[PDB]
Structures are given as structure tokens and as C-alpha cells.
Amino acid sequence: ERPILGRFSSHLKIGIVGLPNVGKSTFFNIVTKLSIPAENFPFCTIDPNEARVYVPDERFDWLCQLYKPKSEVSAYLEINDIAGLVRNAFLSHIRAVDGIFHVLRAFEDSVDPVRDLETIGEELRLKDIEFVQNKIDDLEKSMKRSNDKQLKLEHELCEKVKAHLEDGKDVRFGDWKSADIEILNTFQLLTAKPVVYLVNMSEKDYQRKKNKFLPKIHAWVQEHGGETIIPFSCAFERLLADMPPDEAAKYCAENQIASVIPKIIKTGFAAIHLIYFFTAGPDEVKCWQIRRQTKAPQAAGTIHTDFERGFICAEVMKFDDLKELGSESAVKAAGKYRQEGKTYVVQDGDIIFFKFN
């Protein structure tokens, strides 16, 4: 696997992006009404357009109804509400996020989501060209007075990126080398950011799993990267959120309909190349956010630096093996507990105990 095109951090954000009045803030408000209170993040300053929501996980809940810890800690997704494009402070708001929830209109009050996919598409490609051109101009000036091998390599990349963007293609869909990605991460280009398509439609359409605009959207996406498309009804989700659990479950069974907000949160979290491992014990069961392609020692460090500095090994059992057999004791008895070294890339769902010092 090649290195991942993304910002070097685990404090990642996802931004709600789309044309005016497509249901962005309604979606955000449904998110907020289901968000973790701001005071739970004392190290942070959470703006009114920001929200942090828990990531649901069926493995995590199984690890609770088998351990009953003192504290249960889920992972979270940070979502940022950006206003609609009317043309920016819009482009500087996208610069602050790492992935995109691309919200599309597919409901009747010209309704053309494919056009909107091109409209946002162009606006993002063009803004990237402005960034890349400004770099080429800056690199060329420096090369007149310097002979650093890096200045040529960066210029060479920029020019390849410039031609890629001008051909209508997005940065994240180019075939880049390792050293190419490392420099691209230094730019954090707009069309490098992964997207999830959230197609907003009427409750009726969403319920009967049929929409007139979807086959076209689907055909376009397949021709432009093949990223995930989630159909959803903003109105319906709004209506369900304002209900108490009692009525909400009754409304769902009676209308044969179900919320997709969980899947949205789960897909957003995965989209921005975040995964988590578990530490399961009788005192704590916690999902530990890490970036995909993190090695075992670095994963140890996020819990406590001693774990990384003194790293001996990571004792990892797979969830399925714990599920099939009895418990931790039963798993060790069968000898499933793999002892993985410094070179081991942590896989999502790994239940880990670290050995150090």
C-alpha cells in the first residue's frame, strides 16, 4: 500500500459542502442534536458550526456486554457545517477540513444534481489550479537564486498536478509516487480530500428506495472515482430526531423506514482514513482513533508515550476469534493471541494489549 493522501493528524474534520438550500444545516442540526456536549472536550474550542458525534460500532457494544467496564468510550467524528456556495470564505472553510460530505438536491419543491456535481467540481478544481500556479511562480523565483534538489522536484510535481487538474481530473485520483504524496500533503489541496455523496430526497423516495435522479448521479460518480453514495431524507431524519425513542421506534416499524445517520457517520469516519483499535478490560473499553497505515508502536504511543518508547510487542486478538470462543482466557487457551512487532500495521477492530519497557 502507498502512503495515504491526507493531513498528518488524528484530530480530523469532515465538512458539509453543497449548493445553497440543499439541506446542509438541517443535516447539521440533526447532527448537533445528537452531538457530544462541548464541555467534554476541555482541550478544544468548538465553534457553533462544529459538532462531534459518537461513532456507533456493533463490535464495541459486544465488548461492553462482555466486560461491563467502569467507562465506555466510543470514537467520534468531527463535522463542520459550511454555508452554501453563492459565487471565498467558503474555500477557506474547506481548507480547514480533511474530508467532504457532498450534499446533493434530489427533491422537488432546475433540479439537476449532476450539474451540481460539476458545479462544485469545477469550483474546487479551479481553486486548486490557483494554488498550484502560485506555487509554480514561487518555485520559479527561488530556482533563479538557489540550487536545492527539492525545488526542482516540487516544481516537477506541481507541473504534473497542473496538467492533471486542467484535464478535469481530481488530485486524489491521480497515480502518485510516495515522494509525490509527501509533497502533496504539504499543500492539502481541495480535490485531494475524500468525499462521501449524501443525496437528499423526500421521505417518500427514501422510504421506497427509489429516486429519479439517482441512476444519473450513480453513473456520474462511477465515472468520477466511484466513491460512496448515501441516499437520505433530511426531512425524515429531522422528524425522527425531534421524537422520543418510544415514538421514534414506533414510527419506523409502522412506516417500514430506518435512520441512515449511523451509516453516514460511519462512512464519513472511514472516508477520511480513520480507523480504531480496541482496548478491552473490566475497567475500560475504548475505541482508539488512529490513521490507517499506523504501525504498532505509534499506535501504542497514542495511549501513553512509554508504550512507544519501551515497545516490546502488541498482543492482538481479532474480534471474530473473541466472538467465536468464550473470552480472553479461552482465546489464549487456543493460542489465537498474536504477538505483533514494530512492523505490524494495526487493523481496524484489533483488540490490543501493549507490552513495554
Q: Which stretch binds Mg ion (CB under 5 A): 21-29, 124-132, 164-172, 263-271?
A: 21-29
Q: Does 88 bind ligand GNP (CB under 6 A)?
A: no
Cα→Cα distances 45→42, 48, 129, 250, Å? 8, 10, 32, 38
Q: How many residues bind ligand GNP (CB under 6 A)?
A: 13
Out of 12, 17, 19, 24, name the contact with Mg ion by CB under 5 A: 24
Q: Does 32 bind Mg ion (CB under 5 A)?
A: no
- Ligand-binding annotation for 45, yes or no, is yes
Residue whose C-beta lies closest to Mg ion: 25
Asked whether the beta carbons of 314 and 347 are under 8 A apart, the reply is no
Give the whole-angstrom CA distance, residue 31 versus residue 113. Answer: 23
- Ligand-binding annotation for 43, yes or no, is yes
Could you give phi then psi for residue 248, rounded to 5 degrees? -55, -45
Binding mask 201-240 for ligand GNP (x = CB under 6 A): ---------------------------------xx-----
- Ligand-binding annotation for 177, yes or no, is no
What are the cell numbers at 285? 473499553
Asked whether the beta carbons of 128 and 165 are under 8 A apart, the reply is yes
- Ligand-binding annotation for 26, yes or no, is yes
Q: Which stretch binds ligand GNP (CB under 6 A): 22-30, 36-44, 224-232, 326-334?
A: 22-30
3-state secondary structure 254-283: HHCCCCCHHHHHHHHHHHCCEEEEEEECCC
3-state secondary structure of 81: strand
Name the strand (E) or helix (H) holding 285: strand 284-291
Q: Does 326 bind ligand GNP (CB under 6 A)?
A: no
Give the whole-angstrom CA distance, residue 20 versus residue 22. Answer: 6
Give the whole-angstrom CA distance, residue 257 versus residue 281. Answer: 37
Q: Does 21 bind ligand GNP (CB under 6 A)?
A: yes
> Please, what is the minimum distance in Å from the beta carbon of residue 47 to Mg ion?
13
Beta bridge partners of 286: 73, 279
3-state secondary structure of 224: coil
> Please, what is the minimum distance in Å from the beta carbon of residue 107 to Mg ion?
16
- Ligand-binding annotation for 137, yes or no, is no
> Please, what is the minimum distance in Å from the beta carbon of residue 243 to Mg ion?
23
What are the cell numbers at 53? 458525534
Q: Which stretch binds Mg ion (CB under 5 A): 19-27, 37-45, 307-315, 345-353?
A: 19-27
Question: CB-wise, 22 or 63, nearer to ligand GNP?
Answer: 22
Q: Which stretch binds ligand GNP (CB under 6 A): 16-24, 37-45, 113-121, 268-276?
A: 16-24
Asked whether the beta carbons of 52 and 39 are under 8 A apart, the reply is no
Residue ranges for the known binding site for GTP are 21-26, 107, 200, 233-235
Interacting residues with Mg ion (CB under 5 A):
24-25
For binding to ligand GNP (CB under 6 A), which residues are involved? 20-26, 83-84, 107, 200, 234-235
